[PDB]
Amino acid sequence: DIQMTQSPSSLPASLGDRVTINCQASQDISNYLNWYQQKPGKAPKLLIYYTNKLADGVPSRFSGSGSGRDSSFTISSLESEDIGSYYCQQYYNYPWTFGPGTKLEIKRADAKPTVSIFPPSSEQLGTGSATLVCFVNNFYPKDINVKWKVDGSEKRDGVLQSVTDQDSKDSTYSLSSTLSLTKADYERHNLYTCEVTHKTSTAAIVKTLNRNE
Amino acid sequence: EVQLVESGGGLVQPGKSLKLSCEASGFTFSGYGMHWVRQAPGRGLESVAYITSSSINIKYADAVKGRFTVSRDNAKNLLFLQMNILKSEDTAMYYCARFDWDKNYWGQGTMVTVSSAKTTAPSVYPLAPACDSTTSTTNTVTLGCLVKGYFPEPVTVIWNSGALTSGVHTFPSVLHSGLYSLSSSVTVPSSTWPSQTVTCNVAHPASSTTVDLKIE
Amino acid sequence: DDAENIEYKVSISGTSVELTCPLDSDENLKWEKNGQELPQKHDKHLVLQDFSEVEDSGYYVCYTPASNKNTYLYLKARVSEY
């Protein structure tokens, strides 16, 4: 039972450039290696079979290389549609050992997030729960870790950050931060803040909301 | 033309049973070796089982070797996977496939989820401000929808009953305390709201609950 | 658990030499007469009509993209030798 090494497991790259992925097995696979393009939710498409050999109707640019205990793969000049997960898999012995999973991130220009802060719903406050929410949308680059400042004090636990994949229309991300709690701790403070930690603007921004308004 | 259809997955509690059943179309199935493959979310892709054209030789992946059992009916062109003694490892999406030397036939796949957890309906709460609700960002009211405590996945968020899909953002499910929860941004100018109805239609499959909470 | 992939059956009938493969019928099956692959030859049974100790003799490999166990088979007369 063989084993696959994919390097990298995130390849943010500009469009139209020599993107290279590497695969590595335990013992010799004797070229019986495949490559796939799994886009969104559904099934992975085969791209290259028997390493060198390109499959039916796969863009000329895609080049399967490497032999013996190793292998590689290269989108000659990364085009718009080539964005998504890439997998190497072996066919030397059953079970077909599969590769980890390299994800192609389309490198786009930079974008300033749009910070929207929300007060826990009236109906929710009534149920006991008082979970707070904040949105930071349409931004690039990737890296941001927004914080919660409940009356000047950063609330460490009870936070639930969630980020989307690059938006199809512009390749910009999105982020929702869910500050979970009840009226037990909520009814103790009045000024609420969302700490925007990004290079996109001059320094770092916040959007505040003080309970008594 | 060479269509494949994985049938009957969904939730199950641990150590139970499940029969997955792929259907072949457009080929000499009768005499074609078949595979069962899974994509265990996050954990990646995995081969599950392989059964020959005549069912003479069956090969299982080490992880399932034992508890799982592949079979086939060459008359009704059906590939079955007989999963028993299920784990949380076995929580994955399963596809049945024909693996050629140059071709690859995958089906749509059925999503199998293994958890001791009970089916939970979701809490649907709206989102809009009143303090630092300073006029309009650049002339844009950003509005949310919160979906607290639901199990199992998924849940569909339709803004304005699917009409308004222009500038919407529905962030993925965050599992906390064995229960997923999601958020949903919708952005229209201040000319659109509160002027018009911006209704958030949340729909869960399991609990079969369809909320339609508008904002205040 | 189940039994794996068996071994070759060389039947000979004067002119011809049949070659029952260790695998299954599979259709996706590949037959290889020493490096050089066999043109759309796919059943478990290969009939080497009018066999020649030079032309039809050699190393034989029957393999599916499953049992790539790449199990040889020598020939001419004495099968599975030097």
Side-chain angles (χ1 to χ4, degrees), chain A, chain B, chain C residues 1-79:
Chain A
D1 190 54
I2 307 161
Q3 244 336 285
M4 324 316 287
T5 318
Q6 249 165 255
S7 344
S9 263
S10 183
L11 194 32
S14 19
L15 288 94
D17 37 269
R18 187 210 82 89
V19 162
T20 260
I21 297 148
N22 300 282
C23 197
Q24 179 219 269
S26 323
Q27 83 275 29
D28 217 290
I29 40 80
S30 305
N31 298 57
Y32 299 108
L33 196 126
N34 288 139
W35 288 96
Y36 298 81
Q37 206 217 101
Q38 206 232 181
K39 254 232 210 204
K42 5 92 298 86
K45 171 191 184 185
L46 168 72
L47 317 174
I48 346 233
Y49 59 95
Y50 205 75
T51 13
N52 38 138
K53 278 102 179 163
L54 191 64
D56 214 346
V58 191
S60 48
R61 60 171 169 287
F62 291 23
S63 57
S65 285
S67 85
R69 265 146 215 252
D70 290 281
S71 52
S72 106
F73 170 81
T74 311
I75 307 153
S76 131
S77 273
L78 177 87
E79 301 183 349
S80 31
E81 50 261 354
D82 296 336
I83 283 99
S85 320
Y86 283 73
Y87 292 86
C88 64
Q89 165 246 91
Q90 68 84 24
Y91 60 116
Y92 197 58
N93 99 310
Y94 204 71
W96 280 177
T97 85
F98 268 95
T102 306
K103 203 187 211 164
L104 264 281
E105 170 189 329
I106 176 176
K107 270 180 65 89
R108 65 139 277 143
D110 294 19
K112 232 188 281 92
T114 333
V115 211
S116 296
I117 187 71
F118 295 101
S121 87
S122 38
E123 46 254 79
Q124 177 189 204
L125 299 156
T127 66
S129 232
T131 305
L132 231 147
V133 103
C134 184
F135 298 149
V136 242
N137 303 68
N138 310 111
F139 66 94
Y140 196 76
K142 37 136 93 234
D143 288 305
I144 191 163
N145 229 307
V146 294
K147 281 162 277 157
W148 283 113
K149 239 170 171 278
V150 170
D151 261 331
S153 80
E154 190 251 64
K155 302 270 162 172
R156 208 86 193 169
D157 217 301
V159 182
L160 279 95
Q161 276 186 47
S162 191
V163 167
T164 68
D165 302 300
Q166 295 178 278
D167 182 38
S168 43
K169 319 149 190 167
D170 52 42
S171 287
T172 69
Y173 294 89
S174 306
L175 194 157
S176 102
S177 208
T178 335
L179 176 80
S180 309
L181 75 162
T182 61
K183 295 172 102 192
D185 191 30
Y186 167 83
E187 301 271 52
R188 292 184 202 162
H189 310 257
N190 274 58
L191 181 112
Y192 295 98
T193 340
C194 196
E195 219 187 65
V196 170
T197 56
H198 221 359
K199 53 169 265 195
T200 53
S201 191
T202 41
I205 196 56
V206 288
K207 218 56 172 74
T208 1
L209 231 97
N210 177 243
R211 212 165 101 202
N212 46 281
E213 270 106 41
Chain B
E1 283 251 294
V2 208
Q3 338 231 131
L4 288 179
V5 264
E6 295 78 8
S7 321
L11 204 107
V12 91
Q13 249 208 355
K16 290 181 162 175
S17 190
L18 223 319
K19 200 185 200 219
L20 267 39
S21 307
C22 191
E23 284 146 67
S25 87
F27 71 101
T28 327
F29 172 85
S30 322
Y32 258 111
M34 294 293 282
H35 287 245
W36 263 119
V37 160
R38 79 177 162 192
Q39 201 153 206
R43 191 160 67 92
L45 266 147
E46 276 161 63
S47 41
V48 170
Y50 164 77
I51 180 167
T52 52
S53 78
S54 62
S55 331
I56 254 73
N57 186 226
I58 307 95
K59 301 171 197 284
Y60 297 158
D62 311 293
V64 305
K65 217 165 193 92
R67 85 189 86 88
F68 285 32
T69 171
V70 75
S71 47
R72 59 186 292 169
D73 166 350
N74 303 274
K76 303 186 92 287
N77 314 92
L78 285 146
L79 202 75
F80 330 87
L81 188 60
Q82 191 61 69
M83 328 194 284
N84 320 280
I85 319 102
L86 297 134
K87 320 199 275 171
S88 50
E89 287 72 290
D90 309 350
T91 304
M93 192 166 214
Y94 296 85
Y95 311 107
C96 116
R98 180 182 112 172
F99 270 75
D100 278 22
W101 288 104
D102 34 57
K103 304 284 198 180
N104 250 190
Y105 308 102
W106 298 72
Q108 31 76 72
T110 212
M111 235 298 282
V112 198
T113 349
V114 191
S115 191
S116 199
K118 37 201 164 181
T119 177
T120 312
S123 287
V124 178
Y125 314 124
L127 285 319
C131 326
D132 205 30
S133 58
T134 40
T135 325
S136 46
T137 333
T138 54
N139 183 50
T140 22
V141 278
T142 335
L143 293 142
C145 211
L146 211 138
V147 181
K148 184 182 68 74
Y150 78 93
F151 185 95
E153 279 269 68
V155 71
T156 76
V157 171
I158 46 161
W159 270 105
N160 227 16
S161 312
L164 153 69
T165 32
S166 350
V168 179
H169 296 270
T170 312
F171 313 83
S173 69
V174 218
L175 187 144
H176 198 66
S177 317
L179 288 129
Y180 304 97
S181 298
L182 54 85
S183 346
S184 183
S185 149
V186 70
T187 332
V188 261
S190 289
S191 333
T192 314
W193 191 83
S195 328
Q196 283 86 250
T197 275
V198 183
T199 186
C200 167
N201 321 52
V202 174
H204 196 266
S207 66
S208 288
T209 49
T210 304
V211 190
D212 315 82
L213 258 159
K214 208 242 144 138
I215 336 108
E216 50 266 44
Chain C
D1 234 76
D2 202 75
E4 288 246 271
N5 328 267
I6 71 129
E7 305 316 324
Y8 296 88
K9 185 111 184 164
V10 188
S11 326
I12 303 102
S13 206
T15 45
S16 55
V17 176
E18 191 200 73
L19 238 170
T20 311
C21 156
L23 308 182
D24 208 291
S25 262
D26 264 84
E27 208 161 308
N28 243 322
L29 179 56
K30 261 182 174 176
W31 262 116
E32 205 172 72
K33 193 254 169 192
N34 47 237
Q36 165 200 86
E37 101 157 272
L38 301 179
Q40 297 261 337
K41 257 92 191 193
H42 296 324
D43 198 21
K44 202 169 124 103
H45 311 82
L46 197 74
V47 170
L48 291 86
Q49 258 294 152
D50 286 279
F51 199 96
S52 173
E53 205 237 294
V54 266
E55 297 303 318
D56 306 57
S57 170
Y59 291 100
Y60 285 72
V61 69
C62 177
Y63 64 92
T64 54
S67 191
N68 286 91
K69 293 210 168 180
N70 300 146
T71 51
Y72 266 26
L73 193 85
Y74 194 56
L75 247 138
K76 69 169 74 203
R78 193 63 180 87
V79 175

